[PDB]
């Protein structure tokens, strides 16, 4: 077991609307985005983002 240096994607631009989170994602490499709500029904999201 060893420590490896992994990339960090550019920080997202975050825009706020009523009950809506808007992320503008500009990755350098295929970057995984996941989300989940914190309620009793955590609707998960999983997608790899390769382009803006």
């Amino acid at each position: 077991k060893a420590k490896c240096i992994a990339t960090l994607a550019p920080e997202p631009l975050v825009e706020h609307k009523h009950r809506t989170l808007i992320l503008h994602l500009h990755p350098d490499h295929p970057t995984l985005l996941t989300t989940r709500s914190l309620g009793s029904d955590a609707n998960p999201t999983r997608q790899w983002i390769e382009r803006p």
């Binding site: 706020h16 989170l21 996941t34 989940r36 914190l38 309620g39 955590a42 998960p44 999983r46």
Partner: protein, 441 residues
């Protein structure tokens, strides 16, 4: 003096209350959960990892033949290939052209990576629930300890005996069978030991990472050597552990409801905001000061000067008061309409004090307790303008929290109007019958 209550199963948001003992000044109590840990009972079923195929030197019998013998090796294969005429660097190995025989052997063993790169298959059963509770009361500073959330085991925190009741919901994010890989936990229904299939997660199985008894199920088939070449070719199904790594999907770490965090030492789900927790704390007599030695207040008047029903402490109010034996005084709001930021205030013989609160109500109306006295605070609150925040709400919602006075007016007009119209019809119905009765008589 025992105080019993129910607090929400929330981390970082304290439970605040006054412990009221007639004849003694109320002792302000604050119980905050540092973390909540759902620790199921787990039993390691087996360990799976990428396999390695061991291929011993083949037996090449020149001008003759050999026979395969079964051996106690995982997924052991043995086949005898007749009619071989292999060549080495020194030329033809055998003299006979077609009477030579090669015996190939192969078997499966754990790879070197299995010592660091393996998945653990666990069977999960209902276990225990623990939490770390941060408690302060009266003039006693914050104290903390690990407690058992079962409602039976008392915890002594700063001379107070704390019994934290069982969770109102026996919910757990773990299914009956889970797979732990690295820092990740998966709700994967793995095959039982000895029943793994080739190319799937459990093709290779071992009870422990150092066990000498290994189960392997791959379609390991010995192939005939290429003409004139001494080697042991074979075909085999690609490892199902490496296949699973690609098809793992989202881990339980990323999909658990209620915002649970998954830790591995021991395997547990942390900070799941599920239901509520009954509580009972016995505070010693040393914490209670007689009323005759503490300030009391009267002629209270509460003014709400600013209010936004934001998640933060957007409410501000001022309380005018008259008192006797001026001194420090605890502050509390018994209702759920507003959460008070302050715990106590300093009173003078006369004057006023301010406090901050968080409420979801458009028109908050709540009781504020001040040294056994009470005052009602009323006012209007504006909505926040920030759509998204990075902190949780301090207050609690209700059915009627969002109903404004204007909405209530329309509801009252609607319900009153329709009811009055029906009543008018019923009164008219009753009177006409009475009039007709008098016609007869």
């Amino acid at each position: 003096y025992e105080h019993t209550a129910v607090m929400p199963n929330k981390v970082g948001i304290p439970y605040k209350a006054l412990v009221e003992r007639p004849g003694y000044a109320p002792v302000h109590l604050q119980i905050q959960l540092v973390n909540t840990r759902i620790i199921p009972s787990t039993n390691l079923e087996y360990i799976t990892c990428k396999y390695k195929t061991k291929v011993p030197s083949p037996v090449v019998k020149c001008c003759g033949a050999t026979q395969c013998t079964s051996k106690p090796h995982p997924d052991y294969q043995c086949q005898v290939f007749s009619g071989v005429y292999p060549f080495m660097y020194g030329g033809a190995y055998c003299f006979c052209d077609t009477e030579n025989t090669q015996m190939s052997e192969a078997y499966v063993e754990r790879s070197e990576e299995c010592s660091i790169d393996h998945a653990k298959a666990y069977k999960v059963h209902t276990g225990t629930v623990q939490a770390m509770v941060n408690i302060t009361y009266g003039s006693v500073s914050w104290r903390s300890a690990d407690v058992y959330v079962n409602g039976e085991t008392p915890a002594k925190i700063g001379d107070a005996k704390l019994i934290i009741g069982p969770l109102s919901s026996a919910w757990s994010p773990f299914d009956n069978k889970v797979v732990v890989y690295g820092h990740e936990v998966y709700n994967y229904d793995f095959p039982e030991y000895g029943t793994g299939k080739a190319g799937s997660f459990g093709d290779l199985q071992s009870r422990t990472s150092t066990s000498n008894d290994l189960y392997a199920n791959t379609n390991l088939k010995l192939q005939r050597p290429q003409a004139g070449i001494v080697h042991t070719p074979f075909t085999q199904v690609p490892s199902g552990f490496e296949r699973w790594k690609k098809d793992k999907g989202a881990p339980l770490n990323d999909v658990a409801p209620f915002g649970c965090s998954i830790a591995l030492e021991p395997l547990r789900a942390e900070n799941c905001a599920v239901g509520s927790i009954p509580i009972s704390i016995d505070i010693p007599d040393a914490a209670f000061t007689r009323i005759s030695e503490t300030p009391t207040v009267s002629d209270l008047e509460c003014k709400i000067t600013e209010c936004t029903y934001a998640f933060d402490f957007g409410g501000i109010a001022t309380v005018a008061y008259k008192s006797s034996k001026a001194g420090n005084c605890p502050i509390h709001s018994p209702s759920g309409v507003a959460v008070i930021k302050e715990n106590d205030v300093t009173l003078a013989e006369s004057g006023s004090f301010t406090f901050h609160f968080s409420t979801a109500n458009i028109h908050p109306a709540f009781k504020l307790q001040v040294c056994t006295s009470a005052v009602t605070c009323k006012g209007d609150c504006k909505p926040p303008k920030d759509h998204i925040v990075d902190y949780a709400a301090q207050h609690t919602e209700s059915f009627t929290s969002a109903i404004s006075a204007t909405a209530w007016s329309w509801i009252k007009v609607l319900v009153g109007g329709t009811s009055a119209f029906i009543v008018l019809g019923l009164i008219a119905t009753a009177v006409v019958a009475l009039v007709l009765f008098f016609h007869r008589h």
